Design a protein around this ligand. Structure first.
Ligand SMILES: COc1ccc(CNC(=O)c2ccccc2CN(C)Cc2ccc3c(c2C(=O)O)OC[C@H](CCC(=O)O)O3)cc1
Ligand SMILES: COc1ccc(CNC(=O)c2ccccc2CN(C)Cc2ccc3c(c2C(=O)O)OC[C@H](CCC(=O)O)O3)cc1
Ligand SMILES: [Cl-]
Lengths: 149, 149
């Protein structure tokens, strides 16, 4: 579970926000892309896996699971690519809630930047630093450090 | 110590590679940009600080130290913006060596992608996972986790 991430794609302002959630901590990375292609998704995962020890990614949809470019990225980065079937129905609700939370934060910062990508990164910052009391950022580091040790 | 980062800018293929190094661990994040403007640098720092607990950034040059956009991002993200004067002359050699290491890795992967940005992210991955025996990625997590506890 320290190495398990879940992809999530949401929409805003006619653009796509691609999110990777670290399941055990709720920590996230996100980017704005024009559309969710296999190439965009592959590049995003390459970035993520160079930054955190990504063992497994539950893809966000069947097209990214199928994509040979995505599978090639997962091969490259040593990632086990898996489906995102919510065998635990709670997975669904957690992601849905996270998307609503993220959109709320983006609205709260939206006027502090011209470009959506800027607001999304501000939203990533606020989400990861929010104490719920540890933050998601604190949680992911402790989880992973415990695993190293 | 756990919160201190150093910016570093290097060039390849007529493009700019912007790097942030976590001083204590040698862990890096990097991006390819067309040119190193205050705005690009500001956006890069906002991204970094949403992802790791960035307390202090030593800027890579005087233009980024001066830039009001960069100062505004550091204000936004709660980052202490500092100069990058190598009061310890070893700082300067470490960065030069890091740039040469990264360019070497980029050369080793260059034929595995059309776009330089892809090769740079592959280089980030290889650099952070390389056991020197712990990796830079292991070290940053352990350093920050020790600080949390
Ligand atoms: C990480 O994924 C992979 C990493 C490595 C491989 C194995 N190598 C090859 O198959 C290969 C080799 C040589 C030339 C072209 C290719 C095929 N390419 C398509 C690889 C590629 C993918 C995503 C990208 C790329 C590029 C690129 O060639 O640079 O460029 C930037 C965009 C940016 C996001 C966007 O613009 O959508 O993401 C496959 C996937
Ligand atoms: C992160 O730094 C800051 C974040 C926030 C502030 C306070 N808010 C404002 O001053 C503000 C408010 C409203 C409209 C425009 C602005 C002024 N902007 C210039 C802010 C901005 C900076 C860098 C960017 C931006 C944008 C943007 O407006 O979205 O957009 C993407 C590019 C991507 C990199 C590149 O393309 O160079 O980086 C300052 C710096
Ligand atoms: Cl954080």
């Amino acid at each position: 579970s320290p190495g398990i991430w879940q992809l999530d794609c949401t929409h805003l302002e006619g653009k796509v926000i691609l999110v990777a959630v670290h399941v055990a901590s709720g920590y996230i990375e996100a980017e704005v892309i024009p559309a969710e292609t296999g190439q965009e998704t592959a590049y995003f995962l390459l970035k993520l896996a160079g930054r955190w020890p990504v063992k497994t990614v539950h893809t966000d949809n069947g097209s990214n699971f199928t994509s040979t470019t995505v599978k090639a990225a997962c091969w490259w980065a040593g990632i086990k690519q898996e489906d995102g079937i919510p065998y635990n129905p709670q997975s669904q609700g957690v992601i849905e809630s996270m998307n609503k939370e993220l959109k709320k934060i983006i609205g709260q910062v939206r006027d502090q930047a011209e470009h959506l990508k800027t607001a999304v990164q501000m939203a990533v910052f606020i989400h990861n630093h929010k104490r719920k009391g540890y933050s998601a950022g604190e949680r992911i580091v402790d989880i992973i450090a415990t695993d190293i040790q």
